[model samples]
Target: TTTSVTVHKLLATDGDMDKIANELAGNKVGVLPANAKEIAGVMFVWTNTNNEIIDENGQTLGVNIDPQTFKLSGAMPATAMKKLTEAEGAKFNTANLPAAKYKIYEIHSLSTYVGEDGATLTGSKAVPIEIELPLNDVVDAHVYPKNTEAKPKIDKDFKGKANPDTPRVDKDTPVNHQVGDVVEYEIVTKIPALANYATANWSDRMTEGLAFNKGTVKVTVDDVALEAGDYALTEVATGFDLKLTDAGLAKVNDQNAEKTVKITYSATLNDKAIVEVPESNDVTFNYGNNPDHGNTPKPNKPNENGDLTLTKTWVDATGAPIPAGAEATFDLVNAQTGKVVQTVTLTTDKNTVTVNGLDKNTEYKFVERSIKGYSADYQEITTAGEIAVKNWKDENPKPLDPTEPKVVTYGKKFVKVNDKDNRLAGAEFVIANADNAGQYLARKADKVSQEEKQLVVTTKDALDRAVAAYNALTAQQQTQQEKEKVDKAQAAYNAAVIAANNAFEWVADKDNENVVKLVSDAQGRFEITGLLAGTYYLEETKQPAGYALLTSRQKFEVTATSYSATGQGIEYTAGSGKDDATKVVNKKIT
Candidate 1:
């Protein structure tokens, strides 16, 4: 151990994890090098360059690592405790508490180097390092009992809490109390705090305690433990000599205790004065639980989820602490409409919820219409009898709950067919021509009769046979022949698919008076064929809304050899204009 390996700086490299572990084990706390292999649990992380941690107001707690920081105490699910090594803590085999979880953390600091003539390297350089390695969980080792839940009872002397005019036990104090006589005293105690943290901000604290019982009191029952519940005041004993069991007294007589507690009392002769004073402020004169303090029940969080959780432990009309699981009826009013929008009843667990999933940017009001607290058993001590009474603030005339409806928009762009210019968002272009028209007509004619045209279309039988034969070929041969066969088969398959998909096409119904309108709406293009060459207009009388040309007619000049119409004036706003109507009017003709 004396051969020290000072870890000035260490970096994580999964390539050599053993070195990292060895270097870390040598230092009091630092990133372990990979040489220290077989160290079962070690946590390391990348140095984040961003100094900014938490950006929220009043939330100065820095950005915690993913998963979490501290492992909470509870009857953790079997899965949770089993995942301890996988959580955000260091577990090294050589530390003070070896094999225990350690929260290995890193921070930035300046690194200085002494140069020749006692000069430093440039200026101070902030080299980030591992600053803390707190234990991951509550250590099992016996240490000072910090974060104690036990609230010691504290009772002040008479006149301590009373008004100047109120009656007191007298300055000289009288021996008026009998052996069984009980007295009410004012006292303050540290409120019943649990292992958990409080939720509310206003009156973020409370005081809870028991009454003072003073005397040179010896208990017939030594260190009587009771469950958390109400206790009744029944009997008191004079200086009773009590004997303790060997094992019981041994447990109680631990001399290394951080502090000691004692109880004693005194009485005067002639039935004049009964005085009981505490030997020291630190010692308790009484042992039994005081009934006056009642019981402040512990709260368990409900497994419910919502926008807000209100424990509803605030002081009610009658000052008793509210128990958990009270019901608070809320009248949700729309802030914009000033009308009761939705009524929701929320039960106070650690799970009292306000509202959630509200429309973004909407203002709402949660009116406490009427509230019935939990049964005496369930209601927390603070919110005992809080009910919505005649107060206007309780019923309707209260404030509004504004929701900043968090707006998050996610967008994605993808490639589309025939989007050469990226102008069409969802363009699926199909070319219409005389050859396709002729093919359709030929198919129609063939359907009517058994007579078949000698067209150069791949027959179904031919394509199927080719695909089957290609599939059975040897690997190398299949690669070569399958592609050609598939290409040939796919060409006909694509044409047939195109025809089937464009089944929306309707041949121009020449017999009908509005045949042009029918053809236009049907999206079926016609290719006229004849012998003579002359100028003609492809007049689409009632074009489909988005596909229509700005003008119905297109000027055409045809020669004997070749002929085509100019679609320059035709317009179709696929997705060009801000107004939807403009996008619809500008038809695409290409």
Candidate 2:
């Protein structure tokens, strides 16, 4: 005998029938279980697809089962057949059930079961023991289309890589950069339908060489801006964590179920930080009605660090290399923070220093501390890893050659010579300073020609003296041609001496012209230049032809008044600018 089959709708005590009704109304619905408890009631609906329930003769067919229990005794109808026939037309087609080729879903729910001994048994976490059965096993099983809600999903990418117009290192490939580059991170979150999100957060961690750039965090939902108060951010030792506030979560839910949340933040790779290992960032999400979803950390790298070197050298103002032993100081400061990184002193043995392990594409400044006689050139290095600096001396040093030609003018008290109130010329003088602790004149190659004129005059005077001795000789002591030769030599010496003195006198009045000459002209005014700064004593070696010899030596000072780097010249003035010092001017030789 073939046992008859009947369709029944079993209702548990705590089942939410209204909830099930709404779920059934959707186009694609899931088998979500309601609360489970003891069996309450069963309603018989229909029979198998063949003409099973309505036989040719109506027999008031019913299910054979206990009225208050789950045992099926035989076919028994708790309700009359009249009611079963009336509900038969209301039952729809079984097309909603999965096709034979389709897989079916097994449902489960949290429940409490009571045993005969009255001991209670509970399912895991109120939702356990998934119901597993074949589709053909259930009576009147059918397939029906139902509404479905999409589950929550999330995605994250670097904003730099996502933007279409931007050129980026391919995200699929490993990323590499210099130590000071910047990277922007963007995260997109899809809010699940019918879900109440209690917590929505995005997190990231930096790997040693990276740091958060301040004030770059931003958040938006479906293109609507969110305020800072809508979120909370906390910085941890390794990185920072961020989450939406209660208000922010509500705002996300207020949007249609099709909306998404977008968050963006920025960070910089620090200069001193090195990146040996790849940097990774991770994110996690949570909601009240759905399972949690998380993503593993992604990776990036910054591979290279650059180097910097500085060379220090000393030289005179004219670029002649000076001997070592002079000391100088310098400081290396960070360009971004304005903090000094290192300070060093440059000596003869340690003039050059190299700074390694520096950041590429970063900025730095080099500053020089004070060095007594030299002024350094400050520089900012960008591209090249190395630099050289020449510290030039600020002032010209004292002269090295004592006999170097220097101009010293002599004064005359407006005496008439050749019918004119004229200045004395051909007054020979020797310039000297205190032997032990005195001023020394520095030599220059250009001044030699002018000093040679003075020597020519001295030779002429020696020849004149010899001629005088020859003229004083007796006829027996002096040869006849000796007198003639001595007279002839004296005349030639006179011509040359007069010519040289005349030229010197003319140049003196013009003041430092042609050469710094020693003679004075008609105005009794002459300037002496080409003199180094120091104290000097002038002694008259020979008096002018018509003037009395200078009886005492005159001491005066040569003080440097101005220096011109462009012209490479130093101007000297008289006086030490002291109360007891004797003052002198180039115009007056007193």
Candidate 3:
């Protein structure tokens, strides 16, 4: 009669039935050890006292061995002792055992479980047990041996598009990113020793603002790369997952001690890039917790991303904020490429703005666009994301208050000279506001040293009486009245203008300190300022000695259109040059 026996592999890490069915595919180097437990625990037991081996029945087998020894002393080796490799189904059966009292077992001599790359997965092989055949009534026997288990390592990281470097998020290091940036990422993990483990898969998950690109996934182990058939890459809601194929797990298992497995891919920072608020990403490595079983959940979450802002403020030259403001525009440009990254605009009301969707690892500069009336002192955006633009107004078109702009008033100017164009002096004249018979144009000049402190002496009341007369003439022309009447009104307005100039009371205005009689300076110039718009008259009451008495009180009109923004404060229609429309020349009467 014949009896049978079989052997099975057990894992020390953990054991699962589903994983065991996978068989670790192309895994190799699973050998067996010998001299373990006897087949029948009741009939024959392995007992030892101080290195003396004995059966439970007090019978000695005439052999001395250690407890964990893998050799059988004084025992014959079985026929066809060369056992099966794992590829041939790790099994050995005793189909030729006769009806007799005997034991079958395996033995080891300094053996090791190794892969093709020469790494010791489990130094010791699976320990085998002995089987006694006499008591077996055609029963097939089976034995299970436990194996040593191990784990792989993993780290998640990324790199900038321009540089081939990593900002390891797994190690708590972070880097800056921009919108539409294709981030190069990698997960450096070790391939598990498939002979001792049933490796599962790997996966990743990024935050919402980061979009994963499935097309760029690449798997590499040290210097060698894996083919498309080596893994199955499936897209997930948050990111993607990679499952090792049967051939893939076995191919990696054949390496030296499970070499470094690098999984690289890319993701873009989409339009909805985050700022200020916290951001995080994940890298998950799903591996067998034991030799033939469950997946170990290993996910690493790391924080990464930053923010920058620019505040535009209007200030005076002394750094004080102005009560009123102006409009401006600025661009945030990449200093390296000289390309504009973002643009911001601010008005008189909204003077502060923050820049978004721009990143670090950078050189940034500010480019201010064309703006009127204001000059900006710009401070570029710092690495820490701050901008300060202090501004001042260069042109004050309108006064800040209703108070008069004293020094920048109109002027009435003419040179004093004789008939030969020889300049004269001490030719006294006076100005009169003809509309208000006695009032004149005057200013309190002694209030400040060298200040054109324009304050009126008497209440100012003046207007263009010529303007009223011209309007009547304009109506008569529209009515097509007598051409002579239109001409008469026009000439009447001119005569009033001339009369207003000669009507000044040169002697009576002496009591008003702010008022002055017009006298020619040594330079032969009669210059009057604070030239209010009105019918103004000038009287030549005195002249230079030896000059014949010239009896003339001149009429001149000062109009409101003469005001200017320039320092001169007037747009002159007449002057000493050929462009002068109204010539003023005083001659000696013969």
Candidate 4:
């Protein structure tokens, strides 16, 4: 007779190895080994009902329990390997199975068997059966990542920022950097879980166009400061090599979670650093799964080019910002080629512009294209965009130049008689150059011409004078010819006076040599426009009906002074007082 024996695999509630081990010890069908304290992990194998190995797929699974009591060396039969391969429904892949260092449990159960006496089989003692054990149900499988879970990222900027977080990445075309420009770079590495990074090293190789700025390397972990001695750096001909010490690695491993490691540095783009092609800075990271393992390197290439910015501002004479709607046109040109690169209008909304990928170390030009109302003191300048350039001063002069502003200023001279505020009209004055040369100044309206109004006025005056002369002769004293003469003169004067108001004939001649003759308007005000800084003679040429001319010439100067405007015209306080010597005749003169 044979005793029937069976072995059962135990499954735990949780997938925890220690938890399963404790629970398995309490299982009625299994017994823990006496040296269970020395066990490191659990192992499992698969078998069929016939106790033979069975192949389901291409692979099988088994574990070698190290420190076995015998020379067994944890060697297993083909049936055990095949049985373990299908353990836990093959959820765990073959690679994930333990190769050595595991614990073994023995399980046996008997239902009925024939005793040696050959009686009817009723009861039997427990049979000693053996089977390998596993801590959990051999839960989830190990999945390969679709991509590299651990990666390094690089970012750059012209500013000296440790991290700009700008969209400029390693794979895209690099931003143009210029000579004397400070380009900052940052490299970030991610800490991977379920892995031991025994070594953390960063290596970089730069193009000849760039020089690393010494003493600028900085390392940080999770934004926290790390000691400089924790890392060692070696400067090479091409670039640099940076690695963390053993102490640093130990500190990193203690976390046993995801972490961030960041390294930053700055480099100068000098004259020698300019390159026609995209300048590249390649960085490689060396890391390993264990201290005894060799380092595995991953490299990245980040490129850079020359870049620049242009700023425009509109301002007034006082250097203050002008009103809105003021615009200035500008042209960016290549200084070497003298070709206009772009033309732009700078207004209140858009006053600054940035150009990328310019030729490194090359000079660029900023040209003022045109502006309707505003002008620049400087039109063109050759410089690099690295340094900010401003176009603020307006150069065009007003009134004199049509394209310039109309800001010219002059003072007004008022003539009055007898201290009355009433202006004395019909008063003529000539403004000659300081040298006293009479240069002809074209007046808007000339003196009275042979028009009906002017002729009538002239004839009326002559007739009045002739009639007065004739009236002065008594009836006997007046001769016939004299009467006829008076009559003829009277007829002509009457006809002339009845015509119309006379137009004044302006006296203008280039031969006058800088002399401008001006007559008082109805308001008794004479204004000199477009007068620069100088001295001029303000001599009275003709007096009004009830005024006398000045005895001598009066000289007044137009200085770099400003004045206010009155209802009459621009009021000049410099020569406001009425001088009796230069005044016109106050009494009636006929």
Q: Please, what is the whole-model Cα lDDT of each candidate in the order they appear?
A: 0.26, 0.40, 0.44, 0.41
Tens-place lDDT digits, model 3, residues 229-262: 8788877534776878777776666342456767
Kindly provide the TM-score of model 3 when superposed on the true structure, using C-alpha atoms.
0.29
The clash numbers for all candidates, in the given order, read: 42, 24, 4, 37
| lDDT leaderboard ranking | 3, 4, 2, 1
Q: Write the per-residue lDDT of candidate 1 for residues 39-99, one digit (tens) a residue.
A: 1122222212232122111121333432222222222222110111111133322232222
Backbone clashes, candidate 3:
4
TM-score to native of every candidate shown: 0.15, 0.28, 0.29, 0.28
For candidate 4, lDDT tens digit of each residue in 237-349?
Answer: 44676788876665454342455777777665432332223344545454543221111111111113565555565566356776534565666654333346677566668
Which regions of candidate 3 fall more than 4 Å away from where they truly are?
1-145, 159-170, 196-199, 254-256, 289-590
Q: Would you give me the overall lDDT of model 2?
A: 0.40
Instruction: Report the number of the highest-lDDT candidate.
Output: 3
Least accurate stretch of 10 residues (summed lDDT) in model 4? 398-407
| Model 4 residue 414 lDDT score | 45
Q: After superposition, how far is residue 421 of candidate 3 from its true place, in Å?
A: 58
Residue 508's C-alpha lDDT in candidate 3? 40
Question: Between candidates 1 and 2, which one is better according to TM-score?
Answer: 2
Candidate ordering by TM-score (highest first): 3, 2, 4, 1
lDDT of 2 by residue, 478-522 (tens): 564653454454445434332333211111122232222233222
Q: In candidate 3, list every pair of residues with a backbone clash.
A: 34-106, 500-537, 501-537, 501-538
